[PDB]
Amino acid sequence: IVMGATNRPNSIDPALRRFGRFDREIDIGVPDEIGRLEVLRIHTKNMKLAEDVDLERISKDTHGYVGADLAALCTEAALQCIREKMDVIDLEDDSIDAEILNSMAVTNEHFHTALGN
Amino acid sequence: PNRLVVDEAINDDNSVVSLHPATMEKLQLFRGDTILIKGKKRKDTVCIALADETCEEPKIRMNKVVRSNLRVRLGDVISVHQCPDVKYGKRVHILPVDDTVEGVTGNLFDAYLKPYFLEAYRPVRKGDLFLVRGGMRSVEFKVIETDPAEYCVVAPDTEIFCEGEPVKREDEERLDDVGYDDVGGVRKQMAQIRELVELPLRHPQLFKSIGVKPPKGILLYGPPGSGKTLIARAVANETGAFFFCINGPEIMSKLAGESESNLRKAFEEAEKNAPSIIFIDEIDSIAPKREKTNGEVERRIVSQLLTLMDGLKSRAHVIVMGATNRPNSIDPALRRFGRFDREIDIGVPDEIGRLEVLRIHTKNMKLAEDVDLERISKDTHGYVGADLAALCTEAALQCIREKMDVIDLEDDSIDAEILNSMAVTNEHFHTALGNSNPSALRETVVEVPNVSWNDIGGLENVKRELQETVQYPVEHPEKFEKFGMSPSKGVLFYGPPGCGKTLLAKAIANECQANFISVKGPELLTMWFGESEANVREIFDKARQSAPCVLFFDELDSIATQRGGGSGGDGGGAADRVLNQLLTEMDGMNAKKTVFIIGATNRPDIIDSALLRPGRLDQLIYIPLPDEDSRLNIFKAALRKSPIAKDVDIGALAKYTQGFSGADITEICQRACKYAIRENIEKDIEKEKRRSENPEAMEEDGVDEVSEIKAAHFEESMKYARRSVSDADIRKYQAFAQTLQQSRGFGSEFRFE
Secondary structure, three states, X not given: OOOOOOOOHHHOOHHHHOOOOOOOOOOOOOOOHHHHHHHHHHHOOOOOEOOOOOHHHHHHHOOOXXXXXXXXXXXXXXXXXXXXXXXXXXXXXXXOOHHHHXXXXXXXXXXXXXXXX | OOEEEEEOOOXXXXXXXXXXXXXXXHOOOOOOEEEEEEOOOOOEEEEEEXXXXXXXXXXXXXXXXXXXXXXOOOOOEEEEEEOOOOEEOOEEXXXXXXXXXXXXXXXXXXXXHXXXXXXXXXXXXXXXXXXXXXXXXXXXXXXXXXXXXXXXXXXXXXEEEOOOOOEOHHHHHHHOOOOHHHOOOOHHHHHHHHHHHHHHHHOHHHHHHHOOOOOOEEEEEOOOOXXXXXXXXXXXXXXXXXXXXXXXHHHHHOOOOHHHHXXXXXXXXXXXXXXXXXXXXXXHHHOEOOOOOOOOHHHHHHHHHHHHHHHOOHHHOEEEEOOEOOHHHEOHHHHOOOOOOEEEEOOOOOHHHHHHHHHHHOOOOOEOOOOOHHHHHHHOOOOOHHHHHHHHHXXXXXXXXXXXXXXXXXXXXXXXHHHHHOOEOHHHHHHHHHHOOOOOOOOOOOEOOOOOOOOOOOOHHHHHHHHHHHHHHHHOHHHHHHHOOOOOOEEEEEOOOOOOHHHHHHHHHHHOOOEEEEEEHHHHHHHHHOOOOHHHHHHHHHHHHOOOEEEEEEOHHHHHHXXXXXXXXXXXXXXXXXXXXXXXXXXXOOOOOOEEEEEEEOOHHHXXXXXXXXOOOOOEEEOOOOOHHHHHHHHHHHHHOOOOOOOOOHHHHHHHOOOOOHHHHHHHHHHHHHHHHHHHHHHHHHHHHHHHHOOOOXXXXXXXXXXXXXXXXXXXXHOOOOOOOOHHHHHHHHHHHHHHHOOOXXXXXXXXX
């Protein structure tokens, strides 16, 4: 079985879409609100999310966002949390306290900021 | 407490540094002890710490040699740490400089280093440099290696070896490697890049604990010569990472097959030396936008770059800073997730940015004490950093101009006194600016205009309306969410020409500290005629990234008139490429985004109705001609900079000059100044005539009549006063305002039981 892949069916040469070569076609379209919710839950499962995180709000406010964009949003939120956590952590020190590392965790406002950016 | 500012030291000894006594006590440092000092580029050195009461508590005093060793200059902050582990060197390898040894016979070690280190117990670190005085000459020496392999104190029993090749001075000068301080105008972008890059490379443990994937792809687009290549080197050198630079032209100039080999070797070596940084300078040549795919080599290289970017991994500790002029010029396939996700805009520097760039480029030159760089920065608009460096070079060249007459060209030798007497002057900078040319003038400038409500004359109703529609949703949006209703995402200004609509927009932007973007209809019209309609989406994108923002579409009716609007340009309406794209982008804007858009039109009866539909630009506000107080405000603003004769108070004139637009006010002032100006020059010409009559008559100390702008010349100017707008145009405007108003009936007839 040969699963092709592309962006739009018209971008492919028609000769490939004749019977025998590539007959079935499937549309992996933009995920819906529920789809965005599952994608966010999948990408954020391994991270240290806060107890006040409201992923449903992010899913509702995310329209036109593909899964990769959602992962980028999560990464941006973590980066913003680091932002807030830079002042205490000295950059010139090759070693960083483990307590601060264990204390890091994203917050809903960080997600809001990342979505804004 | 261990960080101190670098300062000049009283002692010139290379291996001795001075610290404030209480500061040493806080660090538990005693006089004569060996201390490890960390400077820039992760370069540290070892010096003998001495107590100096004259040194300020937050300052550390040290000479030029240690400054070079630490790669820091005056004003830089360095860290001092206890180094009680410095062991007496068993063997130290130090070599001289190639140019400093010419004319010296014998063993340079015995002449200079042997007495310099014997019984001095001077700490030495690998790569350290110092100057030793002996035999009437000063010879530079560089430390090659130390027995501990980190640093040691050279004792009398230490065996110092100087058998090796001399060190080249030109190559040694590279040690002044670029840091964050050598760039300017990119403070915010500098922070973004420093974070996104230095954090994972220096402290990946943070991301690992948070379980996130640090970005690999960074794209720095902007104007040519803005300093892109310097930022990456500064970042890499500050993080201590291995930097490998790739230039698009260099890669594309290689023979087929060799470019791919070089690229793969670059990636492979970069991954070997992790943490590493890769700069694909001018990625446009490597991967230009697919407008036409001609040939096979170009496709091969672009696809090779794509697959190489995809194949790289987060654990590899590799970051790829691209570079280009405009993001659209790059092939979209590169901007997909995984390859090049983050994008940064190294835009034109602002006034402060221009100031820092000028101070950076002119620090090494012999500037005069009367140089006013702030004036140059203020007068330099649209100038990129490279243009500023060119301006400085032109100013120096002009100083040379003034200095040519004395210096004979045919003489192979030139006096040293004249050379030491050269120095640029502010007037030279003015001349260079007059001769120079900006490189960036059509690029959308994003900044916070300084116009304030005080500059806005009256218009209390419109002031209130626009503050309502804009100021609140950007100053108090959280409570808008609290109630939650959608805010207005647009507004349209219709009014007479030359009534200060752009001033109003800029003032409202400043009140909210929100960025203002000025886009005129002619520019979009030209770009569409240039078949570059993607510029419109680019404007919308930029306005979005720099939120909060106020996108001001100047002469919105220009496009409609080009198509016709309501006057009947073509047989029908006004919609076209640019207009339709504008509507499409308008309906596609994010409700949560603080991108407010303002449209200005001098002709409301010709604007396409589709643009006025709710959801795109619906709020319509009328801007009347300035009234008595508004006209007074405009008058004083125009004459605010100029002196006026005491006999003339401009409010009296403003009172009776109804029906006259702000442009007419500006021109009345221009003509009044102009007539007073003719008066001044006529007086000067009469003075010159009198002096010609009596050239030898010594000019007495007669108080020169104060050259002011008097009321007679205001009379002469108003004799040529204009009123561009007639009462018929205002009648049309109020007819539109009435067709809009249609408010009556329930003003007071409604009340609940």
